Design a protein around this ligand. Structure first.
Ligand SMILES: CC(=O)N[C@@H]1[C@@H](O)[C@@H](O)[C@@H](CO)O[C@@H]1O
Ligand SMILES: [Ca+2]
Ligand SMILES: [Zn+2]
Length: 621
């Protein structure tokens, strides 16, 4: 009904239906029939078309053309907002803006409506950033819904490592929807079992109980596209906004960055101390609740691994402080006395250094345990309704969350304490920051939006990098790329579920296609009986190997072979070569999902065959 044509792109918008479509290179995409943009409230969902008053305005500006719509009055309530949908002159992109105008609650906004993608074509695929990456054919036999996606499909979490989703038709015509305001946003996915469609749509939540700021989505219509090309679209978007911070850039400040290339990872612990109120407590099993390996025993194990030719190692050490793993944070001091104290910890670190190996502590600044020495609810998060959240899931029992406004204060305190004891960490791990969503806090003394929370968590990382301590956290949610050197992993979703559970799609390294040259990742080395050797995904992603990966809690943290040292050497060998390079291309060879190739900046090419369970590392290209 309203039609616009600008820079190779056409936008069509119907004033009654509120449906739109856009075209470029002769491909047209439209809103799904029968799926209208929604406001959800505690009391009910409304279509935008449900407003008392809806006006439209045709618009041309120095930068684009399009339509701005104002919507006012819902049920009997004076609530208003406006949208703006437009083509950008310089690019042909289509931009969608939702702008709050009057608010006086709204739970969620589902907008823009998903696009139609309804051919059971099997080469018609949807890309989502749920962990390392998933490509979902329209014919895929297993159901995929938002409630099977981590964190409800929230961006800036394991559910949405990057703020985008994309759909790719078999003819190479595709779109990528980039959420430019991702901090109170996420995606919704609907793929019924066998299809024949997959619908993917943005959602937006209020910030501290108000929609507050403009929400923006940017669509780019691509042609001759494949999944590699879609990823590079978002890579350029990010570098254009200054957030593509390469390892090389990081190395110019902290040359020790390069010293992670080719290391094999060791993840093991010291003190376990499961409290009676913990959900993990086993009341009939004292030896299970309460265990200890000393610093000396870990020192001997490091000497031994070295003596056996394990090679260049990085040791991440759990549960090294007095309260025990997952107890007492942020009061997670001093080094555990029964393990050997500061003396034994220092001796262990020295032994690592003496043998050319690197050392990092597992630490935690979000979980705030009532048993912390200085526990005070005044330092805790308050939710938008003013409640203090609480649970007793982990080893240390009853907890709330520490408001991230204050987390840098605690990081500064604890790390400067550690340093005064002749402990010189090569690295540090601040758990959960890069897996879980950023908190919001309505406490007047430390009010914080989700967006500010990510900034404060980055500030904690910055403290470490300023002291020459390389930074790690749980996963790789891309808010963190400017300030994060490495992670605990950046696994595929399927590696985090039983190998028996059906998958949601074909595994593809969407995150590495964007960020391989920015964040270092170790990789699970496990073999599935009757299934995949996880080594192969480590090679496709050009990552480091886990030599030892002890679970903190049985069944958690992707807790599911005899030549370990040898298998590591092959992975590390590659990593030492391509650890700092772009992952340029990834392909399903011949379109076969079970045959995959990755190509790095220096031409090195990695082919993995999941029929044969075999690999091949060539320099050809
Ligand atoms: C891999 C990893 O360290 N996972 C940990 C888990 O073991 C537990 O400590 C939790 C507490 O919030 O934080 C992370 O999820
Ligand atoms: Ca750990
Ligand atoms: Zn606060």
């Amino acid at each position: 009904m309203m039609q616009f044509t600008m820079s190779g792109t056409m936008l069509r918008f119907d004033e009654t239906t509120l449906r739109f479509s856009f075209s470029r290179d002769g491909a047209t995409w439209s809103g799904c029939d029968g799926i209208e943009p929604q406001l959800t409230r505690e009391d009910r969902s409304f279509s935008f078309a449900g407003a008392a008053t809806v006006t439209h305005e045709r618009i041309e500006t120095g930068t684009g053309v399009g339509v701005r719509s104002v919507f006012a009055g819902f049920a009997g309530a004076d609530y208003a907002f406006e949208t703006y949908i437009w083509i950008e002159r310089s690019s042909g992109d289509v931009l969608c803006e939702w702008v709050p105008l009057r608010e006086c609650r709204i739970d969620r906004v589902l907008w823009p409506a998903p696009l139609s993608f309804d051919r059971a074509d099997a080469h018609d695929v949807t890309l989502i950033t749920h962990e390392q990456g998933v490509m979902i054919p329209n014919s895929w036999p297993t159901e995929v819904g938002t409630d099977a996606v981590s964190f409800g499909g929230r961006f800036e979490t394991a559910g949405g490592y990057m703020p985008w989703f994309a759909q790719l038709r078999s003819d190479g015509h595709a779109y990528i929807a980039i959420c430019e305001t991702p901090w109170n946003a996420g995606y919704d996915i609907d793929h019924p079992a066998g299809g024949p469609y997959t619908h993917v749509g943005m959602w937006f939540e209020p910030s501290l109980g108000r929609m507050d700021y403009r929400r923006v989505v940017r669509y780019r219509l691509l042609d001759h596209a494949d999944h590699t090309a879609i990823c590079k679209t978002y890579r350029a978007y990010v570098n254009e906004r200054g957030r593509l911070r390469t390892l090389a850039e990081k190395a110019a400040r902290n040359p020790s960055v390069r010293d992670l290339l080719g290391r094999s990872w060791v993840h093991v612990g010291i003190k376990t101390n499961v409290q009676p109120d913990s959900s993990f407590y086993d009341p009939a099993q004292p030896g299970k609740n309460d265990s200890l390996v000393t610093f000396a025993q870990r020192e001997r194990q490091m000497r031994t691994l070295h003596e056996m030719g394990a090679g260049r190692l990085y040791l991440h050490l759990d549960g090294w402080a007095q309260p025990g793993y997952d107890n007492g944070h942020p009061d997670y001091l001093p080094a555990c006395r029964e393990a050997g104290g500061w003396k034994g910890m220092k001796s262990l670190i020295d032994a690592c250094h003496e043998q050319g190996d690197l050392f990092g502590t597992h630490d935690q600044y979000r979980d705030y345990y009532f048993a912390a020495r200085t526990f005070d609810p005044r330092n805790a998060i308050r939710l938008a309704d003013g409640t203090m959240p609480e649970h007793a899931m982990w080893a240390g029992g009853r907890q709330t969350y520490l408001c991230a406004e204050l987390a840098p204060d605690y990081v500064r305190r604890n790390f400067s304490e550690i340093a005064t004891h002749g402990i010189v960490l090569d690295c540090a791990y601040l758990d959960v920051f890069t897996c879980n969503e950023g908190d919001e806090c309505s406490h007047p003394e430390h009010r914080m939006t989700r967006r500010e929370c990510y900034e404060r968590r980055a500030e904690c990382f910055e403290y470490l990098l300023a002291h020459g301590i390389l930074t790690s956290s749980e996963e790789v949610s891309d808010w963190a790329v400017p300030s994060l050197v490495f992670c605990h992993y950046a696994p595929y979703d399927f590696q985090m579920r039983s190998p028996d559970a059906p998958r949601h799609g074909i595994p593809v390294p969407l995150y590495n296609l964007v960020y391989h040259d920015c964040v270092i990742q170790p990789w699970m080395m496990d073999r599935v009986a009757g299934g995949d050797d996880y080594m192969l995904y480590a090679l496709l992603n050009g990552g480091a190997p886990y030599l030892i990966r002890d679970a903190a809690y049985a069944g958690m943290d992707g807790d599911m072979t005899e030549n370990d040292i040898e298998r590591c050497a092959v992975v590390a060998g590659l990593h030492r070569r391509v650890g700092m390079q772009e992952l340029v291309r990834h392909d399903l060879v011949g379109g076969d999902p079970l045959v995959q190739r990755s190509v790095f900046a220096d031409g090195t090419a990695v082919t993995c065959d999941f029929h044969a369970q075999t690999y091949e590392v060539a320099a050809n290209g």
